[PDB]
Amino acid sequence: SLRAEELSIQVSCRIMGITLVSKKANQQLNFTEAKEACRLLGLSLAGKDQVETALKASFETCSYGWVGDGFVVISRISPNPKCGKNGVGVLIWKVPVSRQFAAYCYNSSDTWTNSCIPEIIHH
């Protein structure tokens, strides 16, 4: 079975709870494996709407990854030919579930917009 030590985290500072998880090996994750990858880390496979919320907080990636309900997405703020072919927004493809990509994962415990930037403590 998939093990967590086979995974690497490509978004070290989660935005609105969202990270991106890839396989260290060349072969990446099909849709079912993407869900398992997030769960091995205690996360859920992100929904496209959760990725959209992160984009509004300036979450941007340059990797295609699975989200819930069988879409592959990339999160783009700036047009880039090499990152989603100059698209902008959360770009969405409905792709056969056997295809292998990264996984967008969601962490509901995050209380900061950027998990690496503290926010003022309210007492």
Residues that bind ligand NAG (CB under 6 A): 30, 32-33, 41-43, 97-98, 107, 109-110, 115
| 32 vs 86, beta carbon nearer ligand NAG | 32
CA atoms of 96 and 91, how far apart (whole Å): 16
A 10 A CB-CB count for 88 gives 13
Nearest-approach distance from CB 52 to ligand NAG, in angstroms: 19
Query: Nearest-CA neighbor of 71 among 86, 51, 88?
Result: 51
Among left, alpha and beta (phi > 0; psi -120 to 50; other), residue 89 is: left
| 35 vs 76, beta carbon nearer ligand NAG | 35
| 46 vs 83, beta carbon nearer ligand NAG | 46
Nearest-approach distance from CB 73 to ligand NAG, in angstroms: 18
